[PDB]
């Protein structure tokens with residue numbers, strides 16, 4: 001494809017779908033990279049709609065496999081000194097958070113998601129090659145188009161963060177007062193995710209800013225300096241934005257979400273097709289990530305879906321959205 005990769009990840013059935021007597025309507029073919037949905041209504045057992053993506057992950061797909069296939073290529077980009085972004089898009093309950101952060105010593109938990117493994121690899125790789133480096137991370141939430149710092153020890157209330165341009169080459173934004181925690185070792189990441197989780201819970205309870213209706217943006221910035229005898233030194237800065245989007249399924253409270261997700265989709269489609277003018281300025285989410293989506297870089301979207309007939313509507317909606325972002329045509333022979 002391109003620098004923009006769109007993959008789909010289907011989760012296994014959950015308890016509620018079993019108790020509701022739901023049926024599997026999704027078929028994943030990792031070889032042909034297709035996802036086909038049994039769409040028939042009453043008496044219609046023949047009509048199915050197929051879609052093609054850069055990759056397709058079945059329900060048995062393991063955390064490490066999503067990481068190996070989707071993130072490794074991207075992290076190598078970041079290490080070379082680039083800004084990249086990874087998205088988790090889909091219906092609430094389909095695995096966006098299970099995928100972005102997931103759920104010992106140096107060996108990674110098999111349920112660990114993209115975030116634990118990523119920090120993990122930063123330290124292993126930069127330590128192994130003797131690079132001089134420092135790693136800082138920030139975690140903010142976007143709810144009803146307002147920013148909240150999830151790692152600020154103090155200034156913890158329902159106070160939003162001020163966003164604004166900045167005298168410098170455009171595309172960037174400065175988020176006034178964004179807490180940026182320095183990480184000293186790979187394991188220190190779980191403690192960071194704990195603080196975030198605890199503060200998100202507070203915002204949920206004290207604002208109704210439920211995680212399922214918000215965008216979580218966890219950014220890791222790596223400052224690197226590498227040297228070799230008869231090879232000159234290098235100063236690089238890499239940044240990876242790991243985004244856990246709001247569920248794709250109050251009046252405008254659902255408008256801001258529905259709108260930003262549609263704006264995001266338009267920004268992605270504009271980048272794939274190279275149409276002048278990409279609508280970054282139309283949403284807080286795309287404005288904040290412009291600097292990473294703007295310049296040349298690797299960008300990936302992980303579309304999560306349910307396999308049950310109970311969620312057919314949202315699954316088709318998600319597949320259509322993923323298809324619209326990067327139109328890949330189905331190949332011959334079914």
Ligand SMILES: Nc1ncnc2c1ncn2[C@@H]1O[C@H](COP(=O)(O)OP(=O)(O)O)[C@@H](O)[C@H]1O
Pocket residue numbers: 010011012059090091092093094095096097098099212304
């Ligand atoms: N692919 C998966 N494999 C195993 N469990 C998953 C998978 N995807 C989601 N889950 C499970 O579903 C729930 C997590 O869903 P979650 O990540 O919160 O979805 P979302 O973030 O989109 O709301 C947990 O029970 C989690 O273990």
Ligand SMILES: [Mg+2]
Pocket residue numbers: 096097211212244
């Ligand atoms: Mg979630």
